[model samples]
Target: MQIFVKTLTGKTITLEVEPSDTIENVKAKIQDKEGIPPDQQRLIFAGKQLEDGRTLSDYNIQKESTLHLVLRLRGGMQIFVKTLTGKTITLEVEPSDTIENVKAKIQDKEGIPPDQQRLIFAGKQLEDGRTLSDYNIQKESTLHLVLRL
Candidate 1:
């Protein structure tokens, strides 16, 4: 049977499966098709969450049935940067912008020199030569800006 998965962003993912397939199995299939990890994927049908251990037939999910796929973690242009003083600054960024350009934006917002700004996310320091995508910093992801001093 064929089923559809809809993301919060209105994108639809189509999958072909058997009724006997477990939610875990289906999620693995989804991961194969769409790079999202199974643990990060939440599937809901008819307003009820489908458990990982349950089969599609258990929920009576039929062909052409559309399920909602909610991601536990994910991104876009308005990431937040927090200062050592606990202040959060919202910056609009493009995926193509390098880490240095982002620092330039912070400089524009708070007058902090780009050379003195350090951006860190996910326990790693974001470097100048790499774009945000290289660091996997998506929209709304927070970065820590530690002062050089």
Candidate 2:
């Protein structure tokens, strides 16, 4: 059977599985395919969080069921911005702020258009709809900006 992981950024990851598959098994697949560490993922379905030790059958996870993937985050942090061809700059941000908001800051402070910017940190590309918290970005975190010429 197949199940879907709906990320907070609105992307969907589809997985094939058996009823006997454990939550850990599913998480491992997600980690493999999506590059998110298994431990950082929290899967929820039908208003309940899935336990790592439990089997899909235990939760009545039927074919085509969709689970929500929420990335765990710690609190407030600092920011460092890097431009691909220029000097790195410092900025302040809320941990709760979304990537789009941060992009807006770059547009305001540096005059780089938000729509043309791609931000990367820890080898992962940040999505506009998701907050910095979703990536567990914390104090002194550095983000690289890739600009579309």
Candidate 3:
């Protein structure tokens, strides 16, 4: 089955695993893909912690099912906004804030949106449903903003 993991790094990691596979197996693969240790990994599906001993079937995991991965990247905590041209704006944001909130801030401060913005952290586009912390956005993190002109 194909299971989608919304990784802490702002990339969706798709793992192909058998239904009989253990959550531990998923964690192992997540560890490999994310560089986060198995112990540190917190995988959630259906609003419940995915247990290591349970099979995907036990949890009734389906193809294209999304598992949320949570882990802390404890280094950088500031957001750097880079505009389309060549301007950098420094902004302070809580990791707990949603992308929509951040986008609203950009819309207010930069006046660049119909709420239309592409916020990219590292090399991946940050989605609205998740938190900044979900992307492992650190202090001094640079978010490249692509405005829809």
Candidate 4:
């Protein structure tokens, strides 16, 4: 199925997905395109919160259907990365940015793979699909980065 996406930033994109594709999958695509975290994404197809586990077919998402993608504000948050040597690297990010997003940035600078990267925010492990705000991570929140190895 093909559907149109209208983002909060006024960007429009199209998504081609199969009936088997879950909402989570589509969110990942949008996150890839626009950088909105899955947990921060509110997809409105027929005026309902898109459930991650539900398939697109459950919502009758098809051609001519437009998805309204709403997002939380993405700013005023900072992530601190601690190196293996106990050194800390500060990275700027939005509250709506996913841990995976920061992990990608870490991959570029610290050379750590995304899946191999584990993040702890406020003394708790963070989920990849969730936004920093979801975990109550505030500005200058200390994030403990641990490698899977």
Candidate 5:
């Protein structure tokens, strides 16, 4: 059976393992391939950990199944902004909301042209044409912003 594993480097690894393979075995293989320490690894499926003693068969993981193994990274951005002149706006967004949508909201709140606005996150500048779907935004996430004069 082919199992898809996503690594910390945002790379997808495919392995052919027998159905009898346990989750621990998979982790070991991942450690061998990625060179990540076993103790630091965490295999999460559907928001639950695939513990050491669990088997793929126990989770009903089937052949040709694509399992997303996300490597947990430390640290994230703190979105706190103090507006100088423009009004402070709050937007409740779903995971489906794109960054472009948030940009539009900022433009509306600040009365700035969309073409002139800059939206940056994680040290990367977000293109105005890109959507949140491109980045896979999670549900109930808040996007904070400020307007530059």
Candidate 6:
């Protein structure tokens, strides 16, 4: 069975393993090749975790399957913003940019500071250091941004 493993660094490794191979065996193989510890690994499929010690058969994973092994990191947030003039901006930023970058951009365009920028989408505030990719943004995606007193 062919299996594809995607690493945290966006590297993909593909290999063929026997159907009888257990999840532990697969982890060992990945450790040998990628040097990532098994304990730090989190396998996500269809946006759900695959419990430890679960076998491929147990999880209903089949041949030629692709698994995304995402490295769990500490706190992170994402948001999108769009101006009323139909200008869409997608940013992948960290909280460090929350006060400066976002504030400057809004002030420059609409003459409003962080206090007056009413940027929001889906009932969430728009902050900096958030990546567009984190929000699953696609081509021609528009986010709403409003400015008020």
**lDDT against true structure, model 2:** 0.89
Residue 19 local lDDT, model 2: 93
Write model 1 residue lDDT over 1-149, tens digit each, in one string.
Answer: 78999998989989999999999998999999998768678998989999999999999998999999987653445889999899999998777677988999899999999989888999998889888878888788999999986
**Candidates' TM-scores?**
0.51, 0.53, 0.47, 0.54, 0.45, 0.44
- In candidate 5, list every pair of residues with a backbone clash: 98-132, 99-132
- By the TM-score metric, which is better: model 1 or model 6? 1
- What local lDDT score does residue 55 receive in model 1, on the 0 to 100 scale? 97
Better of 2 and 5 by TM-score: 2
Candidate closest to the true structure, highest TM-score? 4
Which stretches of candidate 4 lie above 4 Å from their native place? Answer: 78-91, 94-149
Stretches of candidate 5 above 4 Å error? 8-10, 72-149
lDDT scores in order: 0.88, 0.89, 0.81, 0.81, 0.63, 0.66
Task: Write model 4 residue lDDT over 46-135, tens digit each, in one string.
Answer: 778889999888987777578898875556667688766698989988876777788998888877788898887667888887877788
lDDT of 6 by residue, 24-111 (tens): 7877888898876676567877677887667778777787788889764333454456777777665444433333455566567556
Residue pairs of candidate 1 with colliding backbone atoms: 76-139
Q: Which stretches of candidate 2 lie over 4 Å from their true place?
A: 74-76, 79-149
Query: Is candidate 2 or 4 superior in lDDT?
Result: 2
- TM-score for candidate 4, please give it: 0.54
Per residue, candidate 2 scores C-alpha lDDT tens digits across 23-90 of 99999999889887776789999999999999999999889999999888444566999998888877
Candidate 3 lDDT tens digits, 1-149: 68899965768898989999999999898778766667667888878987888999999888888889876434345688898798998876777767987888877887777357988887898899798779988777788888765
What's the lDDT of the predicted structure labeled candidate 6? 0.66
Question: Total clashes, candidate 5?
Answer: 2
For the record, the alpha-carbon RMSD of candidate 2 to the native fold, in angstroms, is: 9.5
